[PDB]
C-alpha cells in the first residue's frame, strides 16, 4: 500500500513458522528486548497485536554474517584516537570489547573531552569508562533503529510506545494523487525511496532522447539507447494505485543512479506519505474530543487527501454437465437502463460507471430443471414469456463499492492460454473510484497520534490567523501531555519555521545558539525543506532561535510569536480567542482503514451448513457475532425476551425466521420463538456419541 510497506516486508525478522515458536508457546522472556539487540534488531518496529515482540525488523546498518548470525559494524578507537577502519562484529564479539556512545564529543582527533564516557559493557550494563579504556565506538546515531522508524523527526523526544505506534502506521499509509514531500523529515527518506524499487532509477547515464507519460527513452553516451516502460494505474496487492509519473525534461542530461520517475508515494525521488497541513492544537467544541480530528472541506475540494483504489473482480467460465458458460448478453429477464453500459461481447464498455448490484459480466448458464412452480406456468400465458432455460449466473457488483471501469483482461481456451483444467474462459475486470476524504477515515501523523475524522466542516467555521489563512487541521490538546508524544509539537514548530523561512541576524556576532548550528541554516527561503536525524537533530535552543526569526510572508506580520503560539479568530462567532494557540505544519497521512471498507449491515443473508446460524465477514453477507460475554450483559439487565429473540429467531430457528419475516411484511404481531435448531443438532451429536440423552416432558 506504499513503498515503505514493501521495504519493511523484507528486512524484517519473524519468530513464527516451522521450527519456531507460536504465540501461545511464546513466554514473556521471548517478547522482551535483549540488550544484545542494540544495533542488531531495532527495538521499535513491531506489530502491536498479539504478535508483539515476536515479529521484528532489521536495523539500517545491520548485515547478515555468512553463518546466519546478525552482524553490525562499529568504529574502533585506540588511545583516544578513532580510526576510520570499520570492522564488523557479531553479537557475542561485543562482549569482549567495549562500545562507546554514538554521539560523543570528538575533538577532530578522536580524543573525548572527558575521560568517563557513556559506554555499553558486555552484560548490557551501561557505565562510565575512561577515554583511554574504550576500544570501540558506534558507527553513527540511528544505528539501533529501523528504516521505517528512522523517518520520525524528533524521535528522541517521543515515548517508546508512541514511536512504536507511529512506526506501525508508517507502513499503513496509502498513496495520494500528489504525494507532496514533507516539509520536515529525515535523511533516510531519499535512500528508502530509491531502494524501494518502485521508483525507476536510470541505471546508465546519458542525455534524455524523449519523455512521455507512457514511456521514457534515455540516450546513452555510447550509441545505444534505453527505454523504460512505465506502469500507470497498476493495481497493488492491497487495492491501491501504483501511478508512476516522470520527473525529467526533454533534453536535460541525467546521471546513472538518478531518479527518473516518482513512485506512488514519492516526489522528486524522496519519500512522501502524506501532506503538510496547518495545525491548531486547541480543542474545538468537542468535535475533536478524545482523539477525534476535524478537517477543512478545502481538502475535499482541493483533492488534498484523496486516493485511487483499484479493485479486481474475477469470473470463471468452466465446464459442466450443462454444457458450457457463454459470455454473452442473452441474460433472462433484464431491463435496458441497466444493460446500456454493457457491450455486445458480454462485458462492460471501457469507461462505464457502475454501482452496487449492477450487472458486470454476463455468464449465461443452463438452468437445468427443478420444480417449476405451477404459478409460473399460469404466468407465461399472460405476457407470452419464453421458458428462459438458462440461469443468469452473471457478475453482480457487491455492496459498498462503485466507480469507473479501467480495462478488461480476458483469457480463453480459444485464445490458447494455459487455463486450468475444465476452465474455458477467465475474465478479470478492474473497477476504480476516487475515494475522497470523509468522516470516519483514520488519519495519523508520524508521532503516533491517530484518530478518525470527527467532522468535515466548511472553511468559514475554522480558526484563522491575522493573515486570514484558514487553519487546515485541528488536534486536541489533551492527547499531547497524557501520551508522552511531545515530539509532535516540536515537529509542528519546525514545520512552521520551514514554511515561513528565517534569516538569523548574524551581524553583531553569531548568536550563541547558532554557533553550534551549522552553516547555510541561518538563511532559508519560504516553503524550504529541512532534515533532522532521529537522534542527532535540532536542539531546543536551535528551535527557539528559529522561532525568534520568523520573517513574514508578503506583508509585515509575525503571526507566530517567540514562544510559539499564535493569535486566532473564531470563524463562527468572530471574536478573537482570549488566548493564543500554537500553529504550525505537521505531516498527516491517510491510513488504509477507510470507513468505506469497514461499514457493514445485514438484514437476512445466508446460513451455514451444520448450524443454521449466519456466516461471518464482509465477503459474505456476514452478520455480527453475539458472544457469550454480551449475553452476560443481556442477563444483567434482565431483558429476558430480547436475549430469547436474539438467540432463537434472529440466529437459529428456521421456522421462526420465516415466520418473523412474514410478520414484519404483513404488519402482523411477531409470534413466539420456537426451539433452536443448534440445540437439536447438539442433542443429535450427544445421541450419536453413544450418550443416551432424552428430554423429559414431566
Amino acid at each position: 500500500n506504499n513503498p515503505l510497506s514493501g521495504l519493511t516486508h523484507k528486512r524484517r525478522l519473524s519468530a513464527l513458522g516451522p521450527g519456531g515458536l507460536s504465540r501461545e508457546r511464546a513466554g514473556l522472556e521471548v517478547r522482551d528486548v535483549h540488550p544484545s539487540h542494540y544495533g542488531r534488531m531495532c527495538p521499535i518496529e513491531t506489530p502491536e497485536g498479539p504478535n508483539i515482540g515476536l515479529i521484528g525488523s532489521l536495523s539500517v546498518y545491520a548485515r547478515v554474517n555468512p553463518f546466519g548470525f546478525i552482524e553490525t559494524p562499529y568504529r574502533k578507537v585506540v588511545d583516544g584516537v578513532v580510526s576510520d577502519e570499520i570492522v564488523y562484529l557479531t553479537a557475542d564479539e561485543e562482549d569482549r570489547h567495549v562500545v562507546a556512545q554514538a554521539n560523543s564529543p570528538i575533538d577532530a582527533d578522536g580524543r573525548f573531552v572527558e575521560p568517563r564516557v557513556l559506554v555499553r559493557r558486555k552484560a548490557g550494563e551501561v557505565e562510565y569508562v575512561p577515554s583511554s579504556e574504550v576500544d570501540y565506538m558506534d558507527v553513527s546515531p540511528r544505528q539501533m533503529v529501523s528504516v521505517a522508524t528512522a523517518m520520525i523527526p524528533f524521535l528522541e523526544h517521543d515515548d517508546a510506545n508512541r514511536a512504536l505506534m507511529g512506526a506501525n502506521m508508517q507502513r499503513q499509509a496509502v498513496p495520494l494523487v500528489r504525494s507532496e514531500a514533507p516539509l520536515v523529515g529525515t535523511g533516510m527518506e531519499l535512500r528508502a525511496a530509491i531502494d524501494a524499487g518502485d521508483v525507476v532509477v536510470a541505471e546508465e547515464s546519458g542525455v534524455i532522447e524523449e519523455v512521455s507519460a507512457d514511456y521514457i527513452t534515455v540516450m546513452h553516451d555510447n550509441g545505444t539507447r534505453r527505454t523504460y516502460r512505465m506502469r500507470k494505474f497498476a493495481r497493488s496487492n492491497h487495492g491501491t494505485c501504483a501511478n508512476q509519473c516522470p520527473i525529467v525534461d526533454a533534453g536535460d542530461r541525467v546521471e546513472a543512479g538518478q531518479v527518473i520517475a516518482d513512485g506512488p508515494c514519492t516526489d522528486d525521488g524522496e519519500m512522501a506519505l502524506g501532506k503538510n497541513l496547518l495545525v491548531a492544537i486547541m480543542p474545538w467544541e468537542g468535535h475533536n474530543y478524545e482523539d477525534a480530528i476535524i478537517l477543512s472541506n478545502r481538502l475535499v475540494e482541493e483533492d488534498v487527501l484523496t486516493s485511487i483504489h483499484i479493485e479486481e473482480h474475477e469470473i470463471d467460465a468452466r465446464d459442466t454437465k450443462l454444457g458450457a458458460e457463454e459470455i454473452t448478453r442473452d441474460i433472462p429477464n433484464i431491463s435496458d437502463e441497466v444493460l446500456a453500459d454493457l457491450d455486445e461481447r458480454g462485458i462492460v464498455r471501457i469507461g462505464a460507471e457502475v454501482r452496487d448490484g449492477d450487472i458486470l459480466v454476463g455468464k449465461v448458464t443452463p438452468k437445468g430443471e427443478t420444480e417449476l412452480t405451477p404459478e409460473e406456468r399460469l404466468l407465461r400465458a399472460i405476457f407470452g414469456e419464453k421458458a428462459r432455460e438458462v440461469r443468469d449466473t452473471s457478475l453482480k457488483v457487491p455492496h459498498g463499492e462503485s466507480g469507473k471501469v479501467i480495462g478488461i483482461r480476458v483469457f480463453s481456451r480459444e485464445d490458447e492460454d494455459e487455463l486450468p483444467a475444465g476452465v474455458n474462459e477467465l475474465v478479470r475486470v478492474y473497477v476504480a473510484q476516487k475515494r475522497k476524504i470523509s468522516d470516519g477515515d483514520k488519519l495519523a501523523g508520524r508521532h503516533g497520534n491517530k484518530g478518525v475524522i470527527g467532522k468535515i466542516l466548511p472553511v468559514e467555521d475554522m480558526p484563522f490567523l491575522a493573515d486570514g489563512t484558514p487553519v487546515d487541521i485541528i488536534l486536541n490538546t489533551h492527547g499531547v501531555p497524557r501520551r508522552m508524544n511531545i515530539g509532535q509539537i516540536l515537529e509542528t514548530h519546525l514545520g512552521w519555521c520551514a514554511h515561513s523561512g528565517w534569516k538569523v541576524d548574524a551581524a553583531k556576532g553569531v548568536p550563541d545558539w547558532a554557533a553550534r548550528l551549522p552553516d547555510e541554516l541561518l538563511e532559508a527561503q519560504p516553503n524550504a525543506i529541512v532534515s533532522t536525524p532521529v537522534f542527532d537533530g535540532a536542539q531546543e535552543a536551535e528551535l527557539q532561535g528559529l522561532l525568534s526569526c520568523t520573517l513574514p510572508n508578503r506583508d509585515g506580520d509575525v503571526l507566530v510569536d517567540a514562544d510559539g503560539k499564535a493569535m486566532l479568530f473564531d470563524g463562527r462567532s468572530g471574536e478573537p480567542f482570549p488566548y493564543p494557540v500554537t500553529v504550525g505544519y505537521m505531516y498527516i497521512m491517510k491510513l488504509h482503514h477507510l470507513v468505506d471498507d469497514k461499514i457493514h449491515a445485514r438484514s437476512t443473508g445466508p446460513y451455514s451448513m451444520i448450524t443454521q446460524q449466519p456466516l461471518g465477514g464482509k465477503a459474505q453477507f456476514g452478520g455480527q457475532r453475539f458472544g457469550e460475554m454480551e449475553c452476560w450483559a443481556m442477563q444483567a439487565y434482565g431483558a429476558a425476551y430480547t436475549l430469547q429473540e436474539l438467540l432463537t429467531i434472529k440466529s437459529d430457528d428456521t421456522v421462526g425466521r420465516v415466520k418473523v419475516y412474514e410478520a414484519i411484511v404483513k404488519g402482523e404481531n411477531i409470534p413466539e420463538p420456537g426451539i433452536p435448531e443448534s440445540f437439536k443438532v447438539l442433542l443429535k451429536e450427544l445421541q450419536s456419541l453413544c450418550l443416551n440423552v432424552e428430554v423429559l416432558s414431566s
Binding site: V60, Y61, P73, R75, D84, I86, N103, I106, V139, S140, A181, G185, G187, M188, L190, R191, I194, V254, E255, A256, G257, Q258, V259, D268, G269, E270, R516, L517, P518, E520, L521, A524, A528, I529, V530, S531, T532, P533, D536, G537, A538, E542
Partner: peptide
C-alpha cells in the same frame, strides 16, 4: 546528498557519518 538527483535537504546533523547505509 551524494546522490545525483538528490534535492537539497539541509540538515541539523552535528557529525558526519563514516559510511552510508
Amino acid at each position: 546528498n551524494s546522490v545525483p538527483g538528490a534535492p537539497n535537504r539541509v540538515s541539523f546533523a552535528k557529525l558526519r557519518e563514516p559510511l552510508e547505509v
